[PDB]
């Protein structure tokens, strides 16, 4: 199976209240395993998964050092951004940076990720070829030329094919029971009268992993788009995920609708119908 590891950095400047706050989170697939908050009484790489907490002091000290270096880099990038966009030091700003690697079913580097946005909008992203860059504006072009001059993409590739992949495999091997086991969703259909002539059919999919899932509604085997509602997939709080999709139906037509659920943990795509 194909897996993935990703790091998410968030640096927020706060003029008058000290240095910019840096928050880093590490993910294997859809399972967070580490966190680093510069506002933490003891800024140090913390584990958020049992299959990482067993690592020696080296992992945490090194991880902490790297995290701090990253934070500082984001500060310098914040200031540099202040120059590029001609902005004040009294204003607050945000820098977001996601970067990771995907491990194919074989063991080779499938995909690579290194992208960053400034103040909510795209700044610069590493293309699928992992050799070219995409800048969203004039300012990001400076950074682009910079990284084209210092061979940044090449070094980052060296990282992907190196430490990233190896550590991803280490994680997958140290916690196969939680990372490699895809759990099927508990699904069920509910009925909620919205009127004496209309009703709401809600399809529930609970406690599944990973987050990848697909819920749909069908009227007589077709596909309903009109009068439908699908909520953003949400976490259960216990490492699982939830998702429901509802449709408004004329009272007396409930038995003409079918909910279809596609999930990795499911042998065959489920088809549910309201059964009170």
């Amino acid at each position: 199976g194909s897996h993935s590891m990703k790091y998410f950095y968030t640096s927020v400047s706060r003029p008058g209240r000290g240095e910019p706050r840096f928050i880093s989170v590490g993910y294997v697939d859809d399972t967070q395993f580490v966190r680093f908050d510069s506002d933490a009484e003891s800024p140090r790489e913390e584990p958020r998964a049992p299959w990482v907490e067993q690592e020696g002091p080296e992992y945490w000290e090194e991880a902490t050092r790297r995290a701090k270096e990253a934070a500082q880099t984001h500060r310098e990038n914040l200031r540099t951004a202040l120059r590029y966009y001609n902005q004040s030091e009294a204003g607050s700003h945000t820098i977001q940076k996601m970067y990771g690697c995907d491990l194919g079913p074989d063991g080779r580097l499938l995909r690579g990720y290194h992208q960053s946005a400034y103040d909510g909008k795209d700044y610069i992203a590493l293309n699928g070829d992992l050799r070219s860059w995409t800048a969203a504006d004039m300012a990001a072009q400076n950074t682009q030329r910079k990284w084209e001059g210092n061979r940044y993409a090449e070094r980052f590739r060296a990282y992907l094919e190196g430490e990233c992949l190896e550590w991803l495999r280490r994680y997958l091997e140290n916690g196969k029971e939680t990372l490699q086991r895809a759990d099927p969703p508990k699904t069920h259909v509910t009925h909620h009268p919205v009127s004496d002539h209309e009703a709401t059919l809600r399809c529930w999919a609970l406690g599944f992993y990973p987050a990848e899932i697909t819920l749909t509604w069908q009227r007589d085997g077709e596909e309903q788009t009109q009068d439908t509602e699908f909520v953003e997939t949400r976490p259960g709080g216990d490492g699982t995920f939830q998702k429901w999709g509802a449709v408004v139906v004329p009272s007396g037509e409930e038995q003409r609708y079918t909910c279809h659920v596609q999930h990795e943990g499911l042998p065959e795509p489920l088809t549910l119908r309201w059964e009170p």
Binding site: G26, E62, A63, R66, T80, Y123, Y152
Partner: peptide, 8 residues
Amino acid sequence: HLEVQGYW
């Protein structure tokens, strides 16, 4: 954690 630093 990436060790190489990409400066804007």
